[PDB]
């Protein structure tokens, strides 16, 4: 019933730059706030408690500040291991609400994806459904748009996306989109194309095949 709004929702900083998250409580909360760090898979870690006290073992990079309703976590010089989501939490009163979290990620030079397109296996067409798969691998930043078109017809409700975690070496993202349709629909139509829009692209790149080739 106290609401912890933190911003930004996503932070991208170069290796060794500073990192500022902050948190706004809906209601004066004194010094009674902790920050935590979570990484994919792992349970969370406590970094600061009581607004500005490093839990022993946590290194000097991390420091918290503020009291009342406006609080901030600082990361002096980001490092490879600091990529994670960062959460804010109040222990002032009845329900100890967390914030929604800030994703902190390594800034990288921009890079467009390499787009690849896969037609369905004859092996799958026997079961009576066709999955067409478009793969944009190794791009940064994550923000990417991808539209399916079957014979020039913008597809709408019939596909799904998935996205990797940022890469340890590359600091890049890969994405796949999968268009599902029936064997009939697949056999009636002819040109299957995905079209990708991204910062690093100077204008959209289409990858396409025609079924019968």
């Amino acid at each position: 019933d106290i609401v912890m709004t933190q911003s930004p929702d996503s932070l991208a900083v170069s290796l060794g730059e500073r990192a500022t998250i902050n948190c706004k409580a809906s209601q004066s909360v004194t010094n009674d706030v902790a920050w935590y760090q979570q990484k994919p898979g792992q349970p969370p870690k406590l970094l600061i408690y009581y607004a500005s006290n490093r839990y022993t073992g946590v290194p000097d990079r991390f420091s918290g500040s503020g009291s009342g309703t406006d609080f901030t976590l600082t990361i002096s010089s980001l490092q490879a291991e600091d990529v994670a989501v960062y959460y804010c939490q109040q222990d002032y009163s009845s329900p100890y609400t967390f914030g929604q979290g800030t994703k902190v990620e390594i800034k990288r030079t921009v890079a467009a994806p390499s787009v690849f397109i896969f037609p369905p296996s004859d092996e799958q067409l026997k079961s009576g459904t066709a999955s067409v798969v478009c793969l944009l691998n190794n791009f940064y930043p994550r923000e990417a748009k991808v539209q399916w078109k079957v014979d020039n017809a913008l597809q709408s409700g019939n596909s799904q996306e998935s996205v990797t975690e940022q890469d340890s070496k590359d600091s890049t993202y890969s994405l796949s989109s999968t268009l599902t349709l029936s064997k009939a629909d697949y056999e009636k139509h002819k040109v299957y194309a995905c079209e990708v829009t991204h910062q690093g692209l100077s204008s959209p790149v289409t990858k396409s095949f025609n079924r019968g080739e």
Partner: protein
């Protein structure tokens, strides 16, 4: 000092679960135990606390109605029970606690996580289909191959290439739940195209819940 939680569960809608969480190394009854929920790709959300000495619980209204937290000081383990399960209850559940803070109810110690899935879907191994480009010329010297791993339940699957021999350039995607009620993902790998198909690229998929290891030779 460790909190060890119980294993992943798969539960029909309208069922009830009791996740446990056991504590070594410190006196359970001297400190609070908190449970927290994390919906797939969402934030942490505080469910409720319990005082094992008293039995005294506080909850979040969101969770009061349907969640009961209890603690058994005889086994130094704390339990969490949701009734009237629901697909949106699918999330990882954490017990947590604080006892080396020294000034606050902040939680320095957390469990593995315990995954609860709620689904009407039945246990089912995946069907595996090769992702290769049309033809062939193809790139260069750079092509992508892969594996559509489709229609399985529950999670998880282990994908690998060439029985582990091949790790570079491989990305296995976060599984995705379809309207089936079943999971589908794919695994892909960048390779040098001049080297193709001098080398075969087999792709090994393992779904322990349905006792299923399968294998695809991928070729364009």
């Amino acid at each position: 000092v460790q909190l060890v939680q119980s294993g992943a569960e798969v539960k029909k809608p309208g069922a009830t679960v009791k996740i446990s969480c056991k504590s070594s190394g410190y006196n359970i009854k001297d400190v609070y135990m908190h449970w927290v929920q994390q919906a797939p790709g969402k934030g942490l959300e505080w469910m409720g606390r319990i005082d094992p000495a008293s039995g005294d619980t506080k909850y979040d209204p969101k969770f009061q109605v349907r969640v009961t937290i209890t603690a058994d000081t005889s086994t130094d383990t704390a339990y969490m029970e949701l009734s009237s399960l629901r697909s949106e209850d699918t999330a990882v559940y954490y017990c947590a606690t604080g006892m080396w803070v020294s000034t606050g109810y902040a939680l320095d110690f957390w469990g593995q996580g315990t995954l609860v899935t709620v689904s009407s879907a039945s246990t089912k191994g995946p069907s595996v289909f090769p992702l290769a480009p049309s033809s062939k010329s193809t790139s260069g010297g750079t092509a992508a191959l892969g594996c559509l791993v489709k229609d399985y339940f529950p999670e998880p699957v282990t994908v690998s290439w060439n029985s582990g021999a091949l790790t570079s350039g491989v990305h296995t995607f976060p599984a995705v739940l379809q309207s089936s009620g079943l999971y589908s993902l794919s695994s892909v790998v960048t390779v040098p195209s001049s080297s193709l198909g001098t080398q075969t690229y087999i792709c090994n998929v393992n779904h322990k819940p349905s006792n299923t290891k399968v294998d695809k030779k991928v070729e364009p």
